[PDB]
Structure formats: C-alpha cells, structure tokens
Design a protein around this ligand. Structure first.
Ligand SMILES: [Mg+2]
Ligand SMILES: [Zn+2]
Ligand SMILES: [Zn+2]
Ligand SMILES: [Zn+2]
Lengths: 45, 113, 137, 66, 49, 263
RNA sequence: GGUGUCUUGGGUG
C-alpha cells in the first residue's frame, strides 16, 4: 500500500491498516512514512 | 505574500506602453514623458546628455517611488526646437559615443593581449 | 525612526535567511469499548461536517506524505469520530494553519502510552527578509 | 552551516576557497595571511570566510535514518 | 479597498483625540503600513515594532 | 572623443581608466554591467532523491547561485518569449547532478564540478559550470554520509541581475574619480588636519596634486574615471564590458524606436 | 452550511 520506514533499524516495509504500529525486523515502536514519489520543483531563489 | 514579482521591474506588459508623452501647458513648448519599466540608469544618462545642449532650457527627472519601476522626465527646449526632436538627437549622440567607446576598448584590449 | 535600508542583492544571496519548522500533533481517543476515532481518509458518504479544505492529498491511512506542497486550509491529518446512537461518522480532521504555506518534512507515526495511534506532522518553509521584519544589533 | 557560494555584500565567489583556507591554516599561516593569499582583498569577502562557522560537520554526525 | 478611500487609522494607547485620525488609502505591495513621517509625532509611533 | 586606457587586463578582471566621458555615462555603464547584462543560472530544480541533512530549498538556493558559462547566452531566448508551452531545448539548458556515498567511513563532498550538462541548444558554448583550472573542484554544494544520496535535475535559463542576484556577471565594480579632490566634490571631516588624516587614493600618482598657490576652478568637471570590473568567471571581463555597452546601446535604440513609432 | 470555554508563564508596542 504505502511505504514506511523503521525508526530504530531503518528497515523499509509496508503496512495495510490492520497490523499494529510496529517494525518487522526489530519490533521498534516509532515509524516514519516514506518520501513521496511525485516530482517537486524549486525556484532556486 | 504581498511581494510583487521581480520581473515586473523590466518586463513591459502588453497593455502598458513603454513611453507616454503629455505636454506641460504652464510653460511654452515643454513636455512631460513617463518611462515605464525603466530606472535611474537610462534617466541620468539622458538627463546629463540633454543638459549640455544649447537649445535645451530645462531638463529633469525623478523616480517618485523606489518600489515602482518607472521615472518621469520634464524636458523643455527653445522656440524653434521641439523637445521630442532633442530627445532623438540625444539618443543618437549617446549611441554614437558608446559605439566609439566600444571600438577603442576593443583596440586597446587587443593590443594588451 | 528606527527604520533601516537593506541590500536586496544580499537578501538574494542568502543574508538573514532562515528555515521554519511547525509540527502538528494528533491521536485517536477512546470514547468507550469499541468506539474510537480512526486515522483514515474520510469519504463524503459516510462522514458529515467535512472541512472546506481539500482531502485529495491524504494517503489511504489519512496522512499526507513528506515531500508534498501544502497551502493554508489544506487537510494534513484525516480523522473520523463515530456518531453515537450508513453515515455514522463525524470528522476530526486537522487542517493546516490558514496563514502558513510550506512543504511536509517528516510524518512520524507511533503509539501512545495506551497503544492508540499517534501522529506528528512537521511542516517546513523558508522565510526571506522583507519589508517589516525586525532586526537588532 | 555550509560555506556560502557568494559574498553577501558584493557577490564574489567564496564557496570554492574554504578548503584552500583550511589547508593554509593547517600549514601554519595565520588568518590574515591565508585570506591575503586567496586574493580576498575587500574586507566583505574576507569576513565572509573569517566568520564562517561550519555546522554541517555537526549535523552529519547523526546517523542517516534510512 | 481602493485608492483615496477614507479610513480611520489608530495606535494604542489612545491618549488623545489625535491618536485616531482619518487617512486616504494608497494601495502598495508588502504587508506593512506606510505613514508619512511627520504624523508619527501625534501617534507617538516609531518604526521598531 | 571618448578614450579608454587599460592599466591591467587579466581574464577575471580588467582595470581601466575612462576619460572624456560624462560621469552619467560612466555610472550608467557601471549600473548596466552590474544589473542588466544577461547570464545563465539555474532557475528551476527538480528533486528526485535528497536524503542529505540539508533542506531541499537550501540546496536549491545554492545551486541557483552557481556561475555557469554564458558566452553564447545572447544567442538564446528568454523562457518568457518562447512559443514552447514548457522550456524547450532552445531556451533552457538542462543539467544533472548525481552523488552518492558508498562505504561506512569518510564523507563525500558534492562539488559544482559534478554537475553534468545533458541537453542544451548545441553547439552553443553555454551551460558548463565554470572551472578555474583543469584540476578545479568547483564550489562546495553539500556533504554526504552512508546511504545519503542526491539526485537532481536542474534547469538553467537566461536572465539579468535585476530579477535576482544570481544572474549578475560582476562582483564589485570599483569606481572613482578626482583622486585629489580638485573639484571639491567632497569636504573632508578632520580633527587636526584634513591632509594628514585622510589616506591617498591609489590613483593619486596619476594626477598632479594641487599647488598651494592655486585657486579654485569653477569650470572643471570630472573627466577621468578609474574603474575595475571583476567577474565570477561566467563571462570574461572584456565580454562583460562590451556587452554592457551593447545593452546600453539597445536600451537607447528601444527608446528611439518607441519615439519614432509613436508619431 | 455550521472551525468551543478558563487560568499560569514568557514577550512585542
Ligand atoms: Mg516603538
Ligand atoms: Zn526496525
Ligand atoms: Zn565581497
Ligand atoms: Zn522554449
């Protein structure tokens, strides 16, 4: 679905709204979403 | 959030003329010129060029507000001369002076090389 | 009278330029046994009293992703509150502040002391000096 | 944070001189002599390099989170 | 709001009747008000915040 | 009647004395070279992956401030005067930056030399970041640690320094006249004596100091101007001077055109 | 189409 990342072991994964909020590799408590896929433009000013 | 665009200083819109001439009726044979999208760079050059002609009696310019990119210029001439004609004469004279300056700079730079 | 002229070119080259970070927080409450709020993108059919901002930026989890430009009044955390005894939900969405622009930086997601879902969304922006900013020696 | 590309006041490029400045300070040259050798003559350009605090070294110490 | 509209302009505290005066509007960029500098005495105002 | 006397001439700077011209002309030339000579600079940045500690617009500001070779920029079109709905190959130059640190020790520095020109209106000699030498590393842009990555596609466009300082071909145009204050345009503040307390101009030996018996002259105007143009490598000093002159010529020609065609 | 209340502390004029 949507990509996440661990806060402790930097593991990338994806959860589907029914698992608890947790990391797979270590089991850490806080996770961060991944950067979007769209392309972002800046004015360089 | 209220900052205008930095290209409105120099890019002339299509509904805005570059130059607009109105006459000053108070004194004879005088005109008021508003230059849009210009600043002191052209104004001071033209003013000090026109100030050295014998037939130009009054010449001045001002930039009423620094946050708006225009200036207004008052130019008077003698009876026979028309201020417009003096303005083309001044423009042509400065063009010739800049061309001569460029030629001499290029020659000097080549010898210096 | 304590005004001061500043070089526009120096501003353009980065003089007195600063980053700004604002973080919004939100969580799900428990009003009973199985009555709780949920982070989810709220569909119009099942929800009522929806905010006037746009919801088209939320992922399937009711959260926006880092890297997305956000304007004022835009929703950055979608949340629904169930209606006590379809169309059985009220919204508890968190909009962006009506004044601030910016770009989402770091959307954190964890659980609180009691195991309910917890979200922090940090926005980022850059403020360039202009007329009316205050400086001192 | 990181050395500015231009001098704020006049716009000379000072961003390509930070490494040479550090190497000059390593070999014993005092700050005025190092700034002289890099041909920074206006005191605006000189204070660009003399007052820089390089904080990116401190920011880089926190582990990449991915 | 347009140029030359009369608007009441005011600084607190309003210690006397000349702390609230009527001005003609001129629309300008930026988010700061503009005052001619000779009227800063009746308002007791300056430009440091 | 105008005359030029070059005193020093290298690639980045030219020091010259200008004579038999009005002060308004010299100041207009200084202003034009500082503000109205077009160059090329990165005006649009596209971030693919930026996992560095620096923010996206921080890096974008730095990239916009990188000098680029602009020798042929006058044969290019302003991105507001092209029929293309989006910048086409002819009114923009596209650059790439890819950087990545592999390994678990050391720091990888991202320099302006790592920018790679991919497209652009060939075979025009625009776009390349300016290198001092063959071995120049360029400007410091960012620093990278383990697994940190930078993948950027920059767009470069034609502009002038009025719009933004990053389009300025010049850093500082030193400019002075009348080293001995013969015209009395200044009036020196002093404590004991104004001649001892004020340093001499670096062009004092180019003009005769006033004699004590001399009286003030009310016919003399400023006639000799000593100015030192410096560049950022984007343009050469002679190129900056000549294109400033040409830009002034074309502004005057625009005025002349409007006057004649308003009749 | 409808964006809640009160105190504590730190500042600006
Ligand atoms: Mg005050
Ligand atoms: Zn983990
Ligand atoms: Zn400088
Ligand atoms: Zn095009």
């Amino acid at each position: 679905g949507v990509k996440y990342t661990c806060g402790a072991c930097a593991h990338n994964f994806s959860l589907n709204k029914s698992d608890p909020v947790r990391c797979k590799e270590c089991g850490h408590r806080v996770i961060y979403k991944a950067r979007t896929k769209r392309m972002i433009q800046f004015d360089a000013r | 959030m209220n900052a205008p665009d930095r290209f409105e200083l120099f890019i002339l819109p299509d509904d805005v003329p570059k130059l607009k001439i109105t006459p000053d009726s108070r004194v004879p044979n005088c005109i008021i010129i508003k230059f849009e999208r210009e600043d002191h760079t052209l104004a001071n050059l033209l003013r000090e060029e026109l100030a050295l002609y014998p037939d130009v009696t009054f010449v001045a310019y001002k930039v009423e507000h620094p946050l708006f990119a225009n200036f207004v210029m008052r130019l008077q001439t003698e009876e026979g001369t028309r201020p417009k004609q003096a303005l083309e004469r001044a423009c042509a004279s400065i063009i010739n002076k800049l061309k001569t300056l460029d030629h001499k700079f290029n020659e000097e730079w080549n010898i210096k090389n | 009278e304590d005004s001061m002229i500043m070089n526009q070119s120096s501003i353009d080259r980065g003089l007195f330029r600063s980053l700004f970070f604002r973080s919004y927080m939100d969580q799900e409450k428990r009003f009973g046994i199985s009555i709780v709020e949920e982070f989810e993108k709220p569909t119009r059919a099942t929800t009522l009293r929806l905010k006037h901002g746009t919801y088209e930026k939320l992922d399937e989890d009711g959260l926006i992703a880092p890297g997305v430009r956000v304007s004022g009044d835009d929703i950055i955390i979608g949340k629904t509150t169930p209606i006590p005894p379809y169309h059985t939900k009220r919204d508890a969405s968190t909009p962006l502040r009506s004044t601030e622009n910016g770009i989402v930086d770091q959307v954190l997601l964890t659980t609180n002391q009691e195991g309910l879902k917890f979200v922090k969304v940090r926005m980022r922006t850059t403020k360039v000096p202009q007329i009316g900013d205050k400086f001192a020696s | 944070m990181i050395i500015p590309v231009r001098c704020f006041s006049c716009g000379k490029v000072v961003g390509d001189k930070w490494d040479a400045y550090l190497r000059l300070l390593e070999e014993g040259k005092q700050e005025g002599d190092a700034l002289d050798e890099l041909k920074l003559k206006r005191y605006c350009c000189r204070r660009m390099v003399l007052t820089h605090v390089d904080l990116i070294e401190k920011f880089l110490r926190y582990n990449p989170l991915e | 709001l347009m140029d030359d509209d009369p608007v009441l302009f005011n600084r607190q505290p309003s210690l006397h009747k000349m702390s609230m005066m009527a001005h003609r509007v001129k629309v300008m960029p930026y988010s700061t008000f503009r005052l001619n500098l000779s009227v800063t005495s009746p308002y007791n105002a300056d430009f440091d915040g | 009647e105008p005359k030029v006397n070059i005193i020093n001439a290298q690639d980045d700077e030219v020091e010259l004395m200008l004579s038999d011209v009005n002060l308004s002309l010299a100041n207009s030339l200084r202003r034009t070279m500082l503000a109205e000579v077009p160059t090329l600079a990165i005006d649009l940045v596209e971030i693919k992956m930026n996992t560095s500690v620096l923010a996206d617009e921080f890096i974008s500001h730095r990239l916009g401030l990188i000098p680029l070779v602009s020798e042929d920029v006058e044969e290019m079109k302003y991105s507001r005067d092209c029929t293309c709905e989006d910048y086409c190959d002819e009114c923009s130059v596209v650059l790439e930056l890819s950087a990545r640190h592999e390994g678990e020790e050391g720091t990888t520095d991202v320099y302006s030399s790592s920018l790679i020109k991919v497209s652009g209106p060939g075979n025009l000699n625009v776009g390349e970041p300016v290198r001092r030498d063959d071995y120049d590393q360029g400007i410091l842009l960012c620093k990278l640690r383990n697994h940190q990555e930078l993948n950027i596609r920059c767009i470069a466009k034609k502009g002038i320094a009025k719009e933004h300082a990053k389009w300025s071909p010049c850093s500082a145009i030193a400019f002075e006249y009348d080293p001995h204050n013969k015209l009395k345009h200044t009036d020196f503040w002093f404590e004991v004596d104004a001649k001892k307390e004020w340093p001499d101009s670096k062009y004092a030996t180019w003009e005769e100091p006033p004699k004590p018996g001399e009286v003030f002259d009310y016919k003399a105007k400023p006639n000799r101007f000593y100015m030192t143009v410096e560049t950022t490598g984007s343009l050469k000093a002679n190129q900056v001077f000549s294109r400033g002159i040409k830009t002034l010529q074309e502004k005057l020609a625009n005025v002349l055109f409007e006057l004649e065609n308003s009749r």
